[PDB]
Scaffold this active site. Structure first.
Site, PDB file in Angstrom:
ATOM      1  N   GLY A   1       7.649 -68.654  24.734  1.00  0.00           N
ATOM      2  CA  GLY A   1       6.624 -69.040  23.770  1.00  0.00           C
ATOM      3  C   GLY A   1       6.843 -68.635  22.321  1.00  0.00           C
ATOM      4  O   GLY A   1       7.481 -67.625  22.027  1.00  0.00           O
ATOM      5  N   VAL A   2       6.315 -69.460  21.422  1.00  0.00           N
ATOM      6  CA  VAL A   2       6.138 -69.131  20.013  1.00  0.00           C
ATOM      7  C   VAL A   2       4.693 -69.512  19.684  1.00  0.00           C
ATOM      8  O   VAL A   2       4.183 -70.511  20.197  1.00  0.00           O
ATOM      9  CB  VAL A   2       7.108 -69.934  19.111  1.00  0.00           C
ATOM     10  CG1 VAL A   2       6.952 -69.541  17.647  1.00  0.00           C
ATOM     11  CG2 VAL A   2       8.549 -69.738  19.556  1.00  0.00           C
TER      12      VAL A   2
ATOM     13  N   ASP B   1      -3.403 -63.610  25.802  1.00  0.00           N
ATOM     14  CA  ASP B   1      -2.158 -63.611  26.587  1.00  0.00           C
ATOM     15  C   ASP B   1      -2.351 -63.293  28.080  1.00  0.00           C
ATOM     16  O   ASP B   1      -2.302 -62.137  28.497  1.00  0.00           O
ATOM     17  CB  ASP B   1      -1.081 -62.724  25.942  1.00  0.00           C
ATOM     18  CG  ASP B   1       0.330 -63.085  26.398  1.00  0.00           C
ATOM     19  OD1 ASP B   1       0.490 -63.767  27.438  1.00  0.00           O
ATOM     20  OD2 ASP B   1       1.294 -62.675  25.710  1.00  0.00           O
TER      21      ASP B   1
ATOM     22  N   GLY C   1       3.214 -65.378  15.436  1.00  0.00           N
ATOM     23  CA  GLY C   1       3.539 -64.553  16.590  1.00  0.00           C
ATOM     24  C   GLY C   1       4.606 -65.162  17.466  1.00  0.00           C
ATOM     25  O   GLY C   1       4.927 -66.344  17.357  1.00  0.00           O
ATOM     26  N   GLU C   2       5.154 -64.337  18.345  1.00  0.00           N
ATOM     27  CA  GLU C   2       6.220 -64.747  19.242  1.00  0.00           C
ATOM     28  C   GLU C   2       6.317 -63.781  20.419  1.00  0.00           C
ATOM     29  O   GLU C   2       5.720 -62.702  20.408  1.00  0.00           O
ATOM     30  CB  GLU C   2       7.555 -64.800  18.494  1.00  0.00           C
ATOM     31  CG  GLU C   2       8.626 -65.592  19.208  1.00  0.00           C
ATOM     32  CD  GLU C   2       9.991 -64.969  19.052  1.00  0.00           C
ATOM     33  OE1 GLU C   2      10.581 -65.090  17.955  1.00  0.00           O
ATOM     34  OE2 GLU C   2      10.474 -64.358  20.034  1.00  0.00           O
TER      35      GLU C   2
ATOM     36  N   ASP D   1      -1.668 -56.724  31.195  1.00  0.00           N
ATOM     37  CA  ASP D   1      -0.943 -56.372  29.983  1.00  0.00           C
ATOM     38  C   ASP D   1      -1.911 -56.135  28.826  1.00  0.00           C
ATOM     39  O   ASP D   1      -1.730 -56.669  27.730  1.00  0.00           O
ATOM     40  CB  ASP D   1       0.117 -57.424  29.617  1.00  0.00           C
ATOM     41  CG  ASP D   1       1.305 -56.819  28.886  1.00  0.00           C
ATOM     42  OD1 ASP D   1       1.486 -55.589  28.954  1.00  0.00           O
ATOM     43  OD2 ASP D   1       2.055 -57.565  28.238  1.00  0.00           O
TER      44      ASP D   1
HETATM   45  C1  MHR Z   1      -0.821 -62.392  20.568  1.00  0.00           C
HETATM   46  C2  MHR Z   1       0.132 -63.114  19.632  1.00  0.00           C
HETATM   47  C3  MHR Z   1      -0.634 -63.768  18.483  1.00  0.00           C
HETATM   48  O1  MHR Z   1      -1.249 -64.982  18.932  1.00  0.00           O
HETATM   49  C4  MHR Z   1      -2.447 -65.409  18.412  1.00  0.00           C
HETATM   50  C5  MHR Z   1      -2.794 -65.125  17.090  1.00  0.00           C
HETATM   51  C6  MHR Z   1      -3.998 -65.555  16.532  1.00  0.00           C
HETATM   52  N1  MHR Z   1      -4.921 -66.263  17.207  1.00  0.00           N
HETATM   53  C7  MHR Z   1      -4.681 -66.594  18.501  1.00  0.00           C
HETATM   54  N2  MHR Z   1      -5.462 -67.303  19.371  1.00  0.00           N
HETATM   55  C8  MHR Z   1      -4.858 -67.398  20.600  1.00  0.00           C
HETATM   56  C9  MHR Z   1      -3.481 -66.775  20.513  1.00  0.00           C
HETATM   57  C10 MHR Z   1      -2.770 -66.394  21.771  1.00  0.00           C
HETATM   58  C11 MHR Z   1      -1.439 -65.983  21.749  1.00  0.00           C
HETATM   59  C12 MHR Z   1      -0.807 -65.724  22.963  1.00  0.00           C
HETATM   60  N3  MHR Z   1      -1.461 -65.934  24.125  1.00  0.00           N
HETATM   61  C13 MHR Z   1      -2.743 -66.371  24.131  1.00  0.00           C
HETATM   62  N4  MHR Z   1      -3.400 -66.577  25.299  1.00  0.00           N
HETATM   63  N5  MHR Z   1      -3.374 -66.619  22.963  1.00  0.00           N
HETATM   64  C14 MHR Z   1      -3.459 -66.167  19.197  1.00  0.00           C
END
Ligand code: MHR
Ligand code: MG
EC number: 2.7.11.22
Lengths: 298, 262
Positions: free
Chosen positions: A18-19, A145, A13-14, A127
């Site tokens: 952040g990445v 997020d 993800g991105e 969001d």
């Molecule tokens: C939402 C994009 C994909 O990010 C993820 C994909 C899989 N497991 C995950 N566990 C935590 C993240 C995450 C990503 C962005 N912000 C926060 N608070 N957490 C996460």
């Protein structure tokens, strides 16, 4: 620690951030998500400051868990629990048969749980969209997020007007109200409820005005009767077309009586009358709720 | 009034009451500071009030900064020439957390009259974050006050502005106010404000909410009453000057009561 104990697997993800990377703890075997935040010419971003301080406080089964923060001179890593998929990709995978009712009902119940926990701890998410809702193989769904989140006071002050991805944005934000509150997050979850059932966005506007008009055409154009104060609102216009309210069984036709009732309370125009997450947990829609696994491999 | 979060108001207050104990600075830290004093801290906080006025920052932001400084100084020894760097970094972090539009780092470098470089400020930000472990969502006097204001029958702007003024005066003086929790200083300030303006007292409905009575609030109330009486003679005057403004209903111009008749 850490950082030397983590083996990066891949990018998952991105955004901004952040990445995000999938990684594994080499010593414990734990699979994690690393949110990498690049630092520099304004120091640490307010988005990261808010997300870390808030997520360090919020410990709940339905809220993404922050495990660690690795904070060096030039790099900031947030170590999170790993979840296998986001709800949007799950909805896309679920074409042709859709998501089973017990799973939609379970997911919504858990979202309202995670959300009511946020609200009870003076946090607005701001969001809620399916991309920020993460699922695992065991049937859990979690809010993720919190970069756009905010700690509020009681009563609320004026906060950032942005706010919330357009499709999921409440009419009180769109109409430029001085204040908005916990009800903005409920509005977003209402849209998502509909979307879990239909697998398409309920209000896919391409601009603020188009967003408003799509809401008006579905829920009727609000007047002083349905929403005291609406014609006095900053970005209300007397020239707005006056659309009739639809039969609510036509907004989401496959939804049952209890489902419709709840959705209509989540999509109430007046933020004072819109159902709270806490009150929504007791709605008859959830009388037979369970927590099954996703019906598809993630 | 969703703005007053009816369904969560009680949960939130309870939560803040837990968090204020956890976010509390150590009461006797200035004694353990070799090179700085209550007086130097008072100069620092008065300057921050000016900074807040210059950039038109929220009072909440000023309250958070002070909390960050007091917690940082509860574990970190600071030389007097470096106290304002701690303060500037604390105000930057508070602004990023609380403001819609925080001032730029360059603006924070500028208000120290180039005592410090941008690199120093940015480096101190990182240090404060490490010392605090990014635990920045601290309860303040204002977060309690705005909840207490909802118990006015009816709402009175002078009461509100005066209560804020008094809570803000308490930020200047570590002795004695470091020994009181934000919720107790808010309670004393609210009662003292209410009494000054309307002749009324800490209401029964707030006893219900807080468990605080005039008997438990008395110590802080006696302290705040003396601070209020001595405000015009205090070496630090930025809050009094600030609260002369129409924005705050000129409340620093109101006369303190001679007695509390407790
Ligand atoms: C939402 C994009 C994909 O990010 C993820 C994909 C899989 N497991 C995950 N566990 C935590 C993240 C995450 C990503 C962005 N912000 C926060 N608070 N957490 C996460
Ligand atoms: Mg000393």
């Amino acid at each position: 620690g850490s950082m030397e104990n983590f083996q990066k697997v891949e990018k998952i993800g991105e955004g901004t951030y952040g990445v995000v990377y999938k990684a594994r703890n080499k010593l414990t075997g734990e699979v994690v998500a690393l949110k990498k935040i690049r630092l520099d010419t304004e120091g640490v971003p307010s988005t990261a400051i808010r997300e870390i301080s808030l997520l360090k406080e919020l410990n709940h089964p339905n809220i993404v868990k922050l495990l660690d923060v690795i904070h060096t001179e030039n790099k900031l890593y947030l170590v999170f629990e790993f979840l296998h998929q986001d709800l949007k990709k799950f909805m896309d995978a679920s074409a042709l048969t859709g998501i089973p009712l017990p799973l939609i009902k379970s997911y919504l119940f858990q979202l309202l749980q995670g959300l009511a926990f946020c609200h009870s701890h003076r946090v607005l998410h701001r969001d809620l969209k399916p991309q920020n809702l993460l699922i695992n193989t065991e049937g859990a769904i979690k809010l993720a997020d919190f970069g756009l989140a905010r700690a509020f006071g009681v009563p609320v002050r004026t906060y950032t007007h942005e706010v919330v991805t357009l499709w999921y944005r409440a009419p009180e934000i769109l109409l430029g109200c001085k204040y908005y509150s916990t009800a903005v997050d409920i509005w977003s979850l209402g849209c998502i409820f509909a979307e879990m059932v239909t697998r398409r966005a309920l209000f896919p506007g391409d601009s603020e005005i188009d967003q408003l008009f799509r809401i008006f055409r579905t829920l009727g154009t609000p007047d002083e009767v349905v929403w005291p104060g609406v014609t006095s609102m900053p970005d209300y216009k007397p020239s707005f077309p006056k659309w009739a309210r639809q039969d609510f069984s036509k907004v989401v036709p496959p939804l049952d009586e209890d489902g419709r009732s709840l959705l209509s309370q989540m999509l109430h125009y007046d933020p004072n009358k819109r159902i709270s997450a806490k009150a929504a947990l007791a709605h008859p829609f959830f009388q037979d709720v369970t927590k099954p696994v996703p019906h598809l491999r993630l | 009034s969703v703005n007053e979060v009816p369904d969560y108001h009680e949960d939130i207050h309870t939560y803040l009451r837990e968090m204020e104990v956890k976010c509390k600075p150590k009461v006797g830290y200035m004694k353990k500071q070799p090179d700085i004093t209550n007086s130097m801290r008072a100069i620092l906080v008065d300057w921050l009030v000016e900074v807040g006025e210059e950039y038109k920052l929220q009072n909440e932001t000023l309250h958070l900064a002070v909390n960050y400084i007091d917690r940082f100084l509860s574990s970190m020894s600071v030389l007097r020439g470096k106290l304002q760097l701690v303060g500037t970094a604390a105000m930057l972090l508070a602004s990023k957390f609380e403001e819609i539009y925080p001032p730029e780092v360059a603006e924070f470098v500028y208000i120290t009259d180039d005592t410090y470089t941008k690199k120093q400020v940015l480096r101190m930000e990182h240090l404060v974050l490490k010392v605090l472990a990014f635990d920045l969502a601290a309860p303040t006097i204002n977060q309690f006050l705005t909840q207490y204001f909802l118990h006015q029958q009816p709402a009175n702007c002078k009461v509100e502005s005066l209560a804020m003024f008094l809570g803000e005066l308490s930020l200047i003086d570590a002795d004695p106010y470091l020994k009181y929790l934000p919720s107790v200083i808010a309670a004393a300030a609210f009662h003292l404000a209410l009494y000054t303006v309307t002749g009324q007292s800490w209401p029964e409905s707030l006893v219900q909410k807080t468990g605080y009575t005039l008997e438990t609030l008395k110590p802080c109330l006696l302290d705040l009453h003396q601070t209020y009486l001595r405000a015009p003679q205090h070496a630090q005057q930025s809050i009094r000057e600030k609260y002369k403004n129409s924005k705050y209903h000129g409340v620093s111009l109101l006369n303190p009561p001679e007695t509390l008749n407790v």
